[PDB]
Amino acid sequence: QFRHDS
């Protein structure tokens, strides 16, 4: 549910 670092 967490935001990835692109």
């Epitope: 549910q1 967490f2 935001r3 990835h4 670092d5 692109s6």
Partner: antibody, heavy 122, light 113 residues
Amino acid sequence: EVKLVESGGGLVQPGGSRKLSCAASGFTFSDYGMAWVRQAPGKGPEWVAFISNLAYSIYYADTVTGRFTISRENAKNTLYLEMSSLRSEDTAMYYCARYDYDNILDYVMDYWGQGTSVTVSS
Amino acid sequence: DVVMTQTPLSLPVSLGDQASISCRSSQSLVHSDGNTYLHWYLQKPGQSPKLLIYKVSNRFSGVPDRFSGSGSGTDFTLKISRVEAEDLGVYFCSQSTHVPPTFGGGTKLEIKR
């Protein structure tokens, strides 16, 4: 193949501390968010903390926030959990776990280590 | 938090038979991106959980054909079509649609006699 190996468990007094490490191999470590998951005897797993792949996002379960600090160092392929003010209810197997992603969301913990045991007792 | 409710707590089965385990979430597991982030894990004695099925019905790498998952909204099922001795252990469902990710209480797969 993906490998995760945690260490730093042990027996500590209530109010003591721990710094767990998790060594990662077989994937580009800096491409993946990582988590800590703990499990007491007889219980299901319980998510503890999460850190995004470049460490812009960190989240904590309600049961640990304030006391634990998650961190990573991408150049050492290592994830960390500093734990303080430990209570007997923190006694558990502690697992390191990789989060997979296909786009912008870390959506599933797919590889888990064998765990490092932490006992908190007087 | 999202509460994951597994039934049965304990599941006796004959080898070669079919086992069915159900999971119920206390909220919809449809994420705003449209996926349903519901997963199943298998834990054997003295080992960590291993992922079996992710996003309702995708078999993880190396998971044999006899594991099948389905369901929608809040009601989910994992099928093991022909239980083998290596499948005995504790199965957990898990959701990753909402923070925090949560786990069911487990279902122990056990032998009938």
